[PDB]
Design a protein around this ligand. Sequence first.
Ligand SMILES: *[C@H](C)[C@H]1/C(=C/c2[nH]c(/C=C3N=C(/C=C4\NC(=O)C(CC)=C4C)C(C)=C\3CCC(=O)O)c(CCC(=O)O)c2C)NC(=O)[C@@H]1C
Ligand SMILES: *[C@H](C)[C@H]1/C(=C/c2[nH]c(/C=C3N=C(/C=C4\NC(=O)C(CC)=C4C)C(C)=C\3CCC(=O)O)c(CCC(=O)O)c2C)NC(=O)[C@@H]1C
Ligand SMILES: *[C@H](C)[C@H]1/C(=C/c2[nH]c(/C=C3N=C(/C=C4\NC(=O)C(CC)=C4C)C(C)=C\3CCC(=O)O)c(CCC(=O)O)c2C)NC(=O)[C@@H]1C
Ligand SMILES: *[C@H](C)[C@H]1/C(=C/c2[nH]c(/C=C3N=C(/C=C4\NC(=O)C(CC)=C4C)C(C)=C\3CCC(=O)O)c(CCC(=O)O)c2C)NC(=O)[C@@H]1C
Ligand SMILES: *[C@H](C)[C@H]1/C(=C/c2[nH]c(/C=C3N=C(/C=C4\NC(=O)C(CC)=C4C)C(C)=C\3CCC(=O)O)c(CCC(=O)O)c2C)NC(=O)[C@@H]1C
Ligand SMILES: CCC1=C(C)/C(=C/C2=NC(=C\c3[nH]c(/C=C4\NC(=O)[C@H](C)[C@H]4CC)c(C)c3CCC(=O)O)/C(CCC(=O)O)=C2C)NC1=O
Ligand SMILES: CCC1=C(C)/C(=C/C2=NC(=C\c3[nH]c(/C=C4\NC(=O)[C@H](C)[C@H]4CC)c(C)c3CCC(=O)O)/C(CCC(=O)O)=C2C)NC1=O
Ligand SMILES: CCC1=C(C)/C(=C/C2=NC(=C\c3[nH]c(/C=C4\NC(=O)[C@H](C)[C@H]4CC)c(C)c3CCC(=O)O)/C(CCC(=O)O)=C2C)NC1=O
Ligand SMILES: CCC1=C(C)/C(=C/C2=NC(=C\c3[nH]c(/C=C4\NC(=O)[C@H](C)[C@H]4CC)c(C)c3CCC(=O)O)/C(CCC(=O)O)=C2C)NC1=O
Ligand SMILES: CCC1=C(C)/C(=C/C2=NC(=C\c3[nH]c(/C=C4\NC(=O)[C@H](C)[C@H]4CC)c(C)c3CCC(=O)O)/C(CCC(=O)O)=C2C)NC1=O
Lengths: 160, 160, 162, 162, 162, 172, 172, 172, 240
Amino acid sequence: SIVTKSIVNADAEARYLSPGELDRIKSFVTSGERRVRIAETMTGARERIIKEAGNQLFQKRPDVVSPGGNAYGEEMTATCLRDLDYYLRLITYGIVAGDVTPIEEIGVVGVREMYKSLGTPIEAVAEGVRAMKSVATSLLSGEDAAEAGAYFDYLIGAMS
Amino acid sequence: SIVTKSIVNADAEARYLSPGELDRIKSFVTSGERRVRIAETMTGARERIIKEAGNQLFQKRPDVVSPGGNAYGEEMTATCLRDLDYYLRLITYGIVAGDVTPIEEIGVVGVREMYKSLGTPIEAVAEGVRAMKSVATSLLSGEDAAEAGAYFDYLIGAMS
Amino acid sequence: MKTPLTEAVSIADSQGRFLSSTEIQVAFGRFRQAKAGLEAAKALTSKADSLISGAAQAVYNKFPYTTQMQGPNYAADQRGKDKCARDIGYYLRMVTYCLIAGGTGPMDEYLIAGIDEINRTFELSPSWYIEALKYIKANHGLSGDAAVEANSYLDYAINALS
Amino acid sequence: MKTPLTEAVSIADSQGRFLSSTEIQVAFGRFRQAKAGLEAAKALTSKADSLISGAAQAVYNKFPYTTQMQGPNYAADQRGKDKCARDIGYYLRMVTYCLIAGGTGPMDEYLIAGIDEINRTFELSPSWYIEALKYIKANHGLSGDAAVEANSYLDYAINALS
Amino acid sequence: MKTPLTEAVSIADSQGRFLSSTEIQVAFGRFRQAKAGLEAAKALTSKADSLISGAAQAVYNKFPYTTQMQGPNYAADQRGKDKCARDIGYYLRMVTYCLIAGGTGPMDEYLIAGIDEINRTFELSPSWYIEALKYIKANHGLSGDAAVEANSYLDYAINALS
Amino acid sequence: MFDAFTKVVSQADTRGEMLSTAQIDALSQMVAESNKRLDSVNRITSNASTIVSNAARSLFAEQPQLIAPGGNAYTSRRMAACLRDMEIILRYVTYAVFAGDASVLEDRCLNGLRETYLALGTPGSSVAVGVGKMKEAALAIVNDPAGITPGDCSALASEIAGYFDRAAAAVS
Amino acid sequence: MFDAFTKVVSQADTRGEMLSTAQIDALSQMVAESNKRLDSVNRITSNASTIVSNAARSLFAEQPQLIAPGGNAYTSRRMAACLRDMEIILRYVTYAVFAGDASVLEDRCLNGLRETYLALGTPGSSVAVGVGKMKEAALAIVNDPAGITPGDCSALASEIAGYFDRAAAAVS
Amino acid sequence: MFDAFTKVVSQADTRGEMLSTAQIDALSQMVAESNKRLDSVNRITSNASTIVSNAARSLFAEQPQLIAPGGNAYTSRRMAACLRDMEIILRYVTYAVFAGDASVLEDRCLNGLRETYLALGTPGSSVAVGVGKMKEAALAIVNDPAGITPGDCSALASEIAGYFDRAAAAVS
Amino acid sequence: MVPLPLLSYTTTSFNTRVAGYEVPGDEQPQIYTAENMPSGSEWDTLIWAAYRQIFSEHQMLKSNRQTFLESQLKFGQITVRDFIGGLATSAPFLERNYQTNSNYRFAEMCVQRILGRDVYNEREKIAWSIVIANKGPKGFIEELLNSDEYLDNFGYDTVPYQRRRVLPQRNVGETPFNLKTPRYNEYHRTQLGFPQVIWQTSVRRFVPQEKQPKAGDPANFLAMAKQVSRPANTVTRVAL
Ligand SMILES: *[C@H](C)[C@H]1/C(=C/c2[nH]c(/C=C3N=C(/C=C4\NC(=O)C(CC)=C4C)C(C)=C\3CCC(=O)O)c(CCC(=O)O)c2C)NC(=O)[C@@H]1C
Ligand SMILES: *[C@H](C)[C@H]1/C(=C/c2[nH]c(/C=C3N=C(/C=C4\NC(=O)C(CC)=C4C)C(C)=C\3CCC(=O)O)c(CCC(=O)O)c2C)NC(=O)[C@@H]1C
Ligand SMILES: *[C@H](C)[C@H]1/C(=C/c2[nH]c(/C=C3N=C(/C=C4\NC(=O)C(CC)=C4C)C(C)=C\3CCC(=O)O)c(CCC(=O)O)c2C)NC(=O)[C@@H]1C
Ligand SMILES: *[C@H](C)[C@H]1/C(=C/c2[nH]c(/C=C3N=C(/C=C4\NC(=O)C(CC)=C4C)C(C)=C\3CCC(=O)O)c(CCC(=O)O)c2C)NC(=O)[C@@H]1C
Ligand SMILES: *[C@H](C)[C@H]1/C(=C/c2[nH]c(/C=C3N=C(/C=C4\NC(=O)C(CC)=C4C)C(C)=C\3CCC(=O)O)c(CCC(=O)O)c2C)NC(=O)[C@@H]1C
Ligand SMILES: CCC1=C(C)/C(=C/C2=NC(=C\c3[nH]c(/C=C4\NC(=O)[C@H](C)[C@H]4CC)c(C)c3CCC(=O)O)/C(CCC(=O)O)=C2C)NC1=O
Ligand SMILES: CCC1=C(C)/C(=C/C2=NC(=C\c3[nH]c(/C=C4\NC(=O)[C@H](C)[C@H]4CC)c(C)c3CCC(=O)O)/C(CCC(=O)O)=C2C)NC1=O
Ligand SMILES: CCC1=C(C)/C(=C/C2=NC(=C\c3[nH]c(/C=C4\NC(=O)[C@H](C)[C@H]4CC)c(C)c3CCC(=O)O)/C(CCC(=O)O)=C2C)NC1=O
Ligand SMILES: CCC1=C(C)/C(=C/C2=NC(=C\c3[nH]c(/C=C4\NC(=O)[C@H](C)[C@H]4CC)c(C)c3CCC(=O)O)/C(CCC(=O)O)=C2C)NC1=O
Ligand SMILES: CCC1=C(C)/C(=C/C2=NC(=C\c3[nH]c(/C=C4\NC(=O)[C@H](C)[C@H]4CC)c(C)c3CCC(=O)O)/C(CCC(=O)O)=C2C)NC1=O
């Protein structure tokens, strides 16, 4: 969360919480009611966004659908669609968390090793989540979509 | 098994193994080729056993179909056969071990509370394994129904 | 469910008014009816099984072809006789229900409302049920005004059949 | 009177529009139908009397009780046989009328619309007429597409009966 | 979507009955129509671009004022000609769609239903489209019964226009 | 829409058997006390306008916020609708104690009127208190003797107070 | 409410171009086999009352709880409504295989009747099994060539079983 | 369905007192400027067909995807329905600025048409931009002087732009 | 007694309130009118359509048939409107549809069947429910058949139908009212007590997390075969 980093960076110098750090915690909890209402609406529209963003990958990068590519056939593209269900579920974890360290524990911190080991193109994974933001911005009002859209764009440069 | 009941009865006197008792391990191994042929034949029609024997249970016990009893709809009767699939898994676990101690440590040792606290009576599950008993003899031969039927009535004795 | 108190409430509700002396006249009349009708329904409950078997035997007697020809609509096999005498007992139970309820409502809601299309789809002649109801109304063995209104309900079932 | 040209005019009238190519497609199809159907109706007109007697004899054969029991609904006496074979000829004449008209309209207006309540009031089993229509559709002796649509009309009468 | 099979299903559904021989007459007629109409639609697909340009040039020829006066409704500039020939190709594509569908349904749902208010709001004379459809029905170059029913669809569009 | 007799008939049909004897003795006692039940009903019915006027006045003496401007029953039209709602509730109570079953009272009022009073902004508390006061006055009007032969009025006080409490709780 | 031809027309209009040639060869083969589609449709239609009576006959032999008192199809009125529901489903199957598209079957039954059977308390499982048995009997009645020229009904057994499985799954 | 005067009357009745003096001076100034409100309303009304045609003219120049095949306003019938929807919105704007209250515009369009455009698949963004452009052109047509005595129309440009922005935001 | 006016309610956006610039097609409801002097068979189709509209298909039983109302209609003694009023006030309709519903749901059902449209909002159901309570179900049906909305759309001689169910560009319209509003809701279903979700269709532990349906996004697979040419040949590209 946001207090998870703010404890630890205040911990390792044996300091208490300095009031430059508390005011972003006090700003976080008044913004907590907004980010819950963000994090329902992505999960309320969860079924309609997983086949929409996956269809948006398949026109811009159809090479992975093609035989010889990794996501070939209906069965391998079925597990190359959940694979995307986690990365929507992880982003709506971090939206209600305030910070991005739930995604840094589950999503990214070994993903350059395993997608090298699985043979899937990691750049096309970031093309899907870049498509997944642009459909997720359509459902939400823009002043809340600017909040959630930074959590998407964290992950875009994280994969590539 | 015989062997893990052989050794745990030899630690209770802290001696070696009795040589007449070593023949019941040697009789356990040489009579093992026909025992695992029973177990795959129950496994090969485990849905054909269950979808038949479930139907003759409900004509015998109409309380669990007419509303007012314990398990109903699709939402609990599928869980009711989820119990009977576990017990059928225990018998084919018990046949390859030769004894009932895989059924003892897994599936009968706490049965008189986990249905007693869960609202359902005991004796209809004891009528369910009897429903499973009649269709287990009919798939097998004469002597194979005698050995495999010797594990079904152990389930009746611990429950009811 | 055409029972007298229910239809009195329906009249007073559709008129939009309170209850008047008319519904109380309906009520002392209904209690007068029920004061014998409940005991007559108990007596029919007592004689029910023998009446059902006698009606089934009279139906097999007047229509002997139904016992002979092969056909799932006919009671040649045993399951036809089980289902057959089951619907005999159905008719008798609806007669007792209308005797308790005080109106033709229960038979009208449980039997009459679809019986024509059922006998059309299933190749059941309604004359079989007419013969059975005639045997029941001959052999129920009641007496007096209870017997007359029991015969009224059975004749109503007959007229609804054919 | 559900005949194709009549219902095409009804469609164009209820829509409030002129005739389109749809009704002309209906028309070249209807003329294609009538080009064999009129000769098939003439052939049924030729074989009609023997078909009526054969259907009546098959009905007496499958249901022998109707010749035996006394009853004005049954054809035990001679007037029952006259009236009976009269309604056999009625059914066959309606089949020929629907063959000429090109639709199920004439049987739907002359036979079907009240047949259920008539058989209910008169204690006539419709299975007798089903047996007779089955004998007619077995023994009409036509061939080809005319035979298939003749069997279509007779099967329609059977499904309307039971 | 007034196509013959769709409207046959609508008739049988609104009547509440099964399909009869009437709809099968409609069907053998519809297949008779489509057996030439599909090839005629392919031939119109082949000649489509030259027909569109010829219709646009004939429309500019008969109404020369539209090329001259400044106005966004008139095709004086180039964007008027692009949009103009686009709706020429729209009309021709709807003609081919009705040739495939076998009824006036596609033009009735895609063109006709709002064309009057659109030409009212946009200051488009429908006589321009009448001239273009007349040039198309003169110059489509088909022959026989396919040509007659193609002219039928185009004349239907003309009568729907004015 | 059920009687007492149709209730026993539906229960006996759901059982699938004939009516048992003890239910028939219960229905015989019901047929003996059904007139009982309904003389009681008739003296309840004859004073209905006095009952609703005394209930409303007692209520509007008790909660003057409803009469106050901006109150829910303040406007003359709304106040007439208020008295109409109360009279309707009393009428369906009299119907339910006529037929001897609460299913008519349930069917005609209860399932919808709670949501109606929520959607209207009607306070359910005041009309609940008004139905309670109307029921108390109704039993008080029914129970007194004035030229009528002595009878076992009691239980039927039980049933009438049951119907009124069911109405007041379904209103909420 | 779509044909085969109107389906190709709507797809070609959404594409915005003319109809491609391979779709026209497909529609030519459809026009060649559309009568073939039809022969099964007419022999399916002529035996419809026998189909629904045999389907209910096997279903109520199979699940006697529906005939049992308290069952959903127990009452004579409800049993007639049951046969009416089945006959309606068979009729819309015949309509969909007439027009050659499942959109009529979707439009007329599917989207509402699942919620209808939930709200009514109708068990969707029994009517699903009944539609499955009715469809099995319908293909079994259609596939037998009695007094019919020798042809190929392969793909149309495919299509009819598709329509019946769509109906049975939309019922659930 | 409220006026300005009925709005003050409903507020004064919810207060429960008479109308205060400052509200009466405000309503006197409203009665002085109500003609001012509406001569412009008349110059807004007289050019309505030009307004909706120029609005659709700029909108379909701006978003050619709607005119493109497969677009929401592509079909001739749908395009006529599009112009009808726009003309309806302009008419209810003129009604609301006639009565001087936004409650008529709310009542007649707003609460349902957002859900209607969601259910239809209509893009709310394009019609929102079209109502915004139509409102900009409407104030631009209203504000110019061509033979009319000069006056300060500052609060009525304020009110008309308020009504148009309320319509565009309720559409979304 | 001063007549209490109908309670005011707000209108919603519906397809029936706008002008339809539509060409007649297969989705248009068949209009059954008595104005065209119907043949003896057309009278039976009109009567059948009126029963289907007011009762639903499942309630077209021989026992529910109003033979006296049908003979009055066929003789021209009553209008099609009066026939619809007679059906909606009939004993079988009140027993099956009025007694099994609340006044709110009965009002919604009558608006859908008689006016051929949906209810605008919950407040319209409340506004009609008080008419049912004050005048009974008969006086409510008469007030609905006397509405300007009924007269303007159907007159005296037309059988009511579901108005504008399908839009001309959509293969899927609104749900038919007979499927949307069945005879009774969940509330009366719970009062009747019993349904026996008799039989299963088992399977042994097999799901947890899979979105199987690729369905629509695929597929292209046009494919291509690629040739070979020299690397040295400036194909690679040299800026400057
Ligand atoms: C079915 C023949 C009988 C029956 C079954 C029933 N069970 C439940 C709930 C549970 N059943 C189990 C059963 C087992 N758990 C085990 O660990 C083992 C050994 C491996 C067995 C055999 C358990 C744990 C539960 C709790 C739920 C779960 O599995 O997660 C129900 C539902 C009860 C409810 O109220 O929901 C039913 C109906 N009951 C009967 O009536 C039949 C006699
Ligand atoms: C050249 C043929 C003549 C001409 C045409 C013209 N039309 C428009 C504008 C529109 N035309 C349509 C017509 C259709 N749209 C459809 O979807 C279909 C069926 C598939 C038809 C027939 C519509 C809806 C418009 C308005 C859309 C738009 O404005 O682009 C123009 C452009 C003029 C304009 O701004 O409105 C032109 C030039 N005009 C001529 O001068 C020729 C005689
Ligand atoms: C027998 C297969 C199963 C069954 C049937 C059943 N259905 C009903 C009641 C209704 N069924 C419908 C269904 C439709 N109406 C339509 O208009 C259409 C499409 C055109 C369909 C599919 C509706 C609306 C009702 C309620 C209104 C009515 O008259 O019929 C019942 C009766 C329920 C009742 O209480 O009357 C029955 C018995 N139910 C079963 O038990 C079988 C599983
Ligand atoms: C299908 C399960 C079986 C089958 C059918 C089959 N039919 C044909 C051809 C024709 N069938 C008809 C039938 C009719 N035409 C009509 O107008 C009517 C009245 C409504 C009927 C009943 C006709 C006329 C044809 C073609 C023309 C003709 O026969 O004169 C074929 C082959 C030809 C074709 O594809 O149409 C087949 C195969 N054959 C089987 O083996 C199946 C078991
Ligand atoms: C053009 C600005 C945008 C657009 C318009 C559009 N609307 C429709 C269809 C409907 N619009 C309504 C809206 C109303 N109906 C009302 O009664 C009122 C208030 C009094 C409003 C605001 C309704 C009910 C419909 C559907 C029924 C109908 O005939 O019109 C369409 C057509 C959709 C169709 O499939 O026919 C269009 C094109 N859509 C756009 O593309 C622009 C963004
Ligand atoms: C409670 C009111 C009620 C009635 C009346 C009722 C009748 C009824 N009788 C039926 C069948 C039957 N009805 C009969 C009856 C007879 N056939 C004969 O030959 C004899 C003359 C007569 C014996 C009385 C038989 C044998 C069947 C089974 C035939 C069948 O498959 O449909 C069926 C079809 C159900 C089934 O197939 O099992 C119904 C619904 N159901 C009801 O719920
Ligand atoms: C044009 C279409 C048409 C049909 C179908 C028709 C049938 C018809 N058959 C009738 C009687 C009859 N129907 C039958 C028929 C039979 N009974 C049997 O036993 C045989 C199995 C079968 C011989 C086919 C008989 C014998 C009567 C006279 C019985 C009677 O008094 O009602 C009656 C009553 C009239 C009367 O009593 O004379 C009608 C209306 N009428 C029509 O106008
Ligand atoms: C047959 C069963 C039935 C019931 C129960 C029913 C209630 C009902 N009460 C209503 C209004 C009302 N009901 C009340 C009653 C009250 N509000 C209060 O302040 C008090 C707490 C309470 C007096 C006891 C009032 C004041 C209104 C008027 C609301 C309004 O007109 O704005 C309305 C709105 C439409 C209208 O009256 O004219 C309905 C539908 N309608 C029915 O058809
Ligand atoms: C609709 C017109 C009408 C009325 C009004 C009516 C009333 C009525 N009440 C009766 C009895 C009675 N009514 C009561 C009522 C009561 N006794 C008490 O002490 C209680 C306080 C009170 C009930 C709250 C009693 C106790 C009887 C005794 C007889 C019986 O059980 O019916 C009887 C029996 C027959 C008779 O009295 O001649 C009649 C007539 N009958 C009618 O036809
Ligand atoms: C229903 C038929 C009808 C109309 C149309 C009408 C209009 C009208 N507008 C007037 C005034 C006026 N109208 C305006 C309007 C404006 N000035 C601006 O600069 C703004 C841009 C614009 C408002 C947006 C102004 C400023 C006046 C000055 C006089 C006054 O306050 O009424 C007057 C005063 C009397 C007169 O002019 O003879 C008339 C008659 N009177 C009628 O009986």
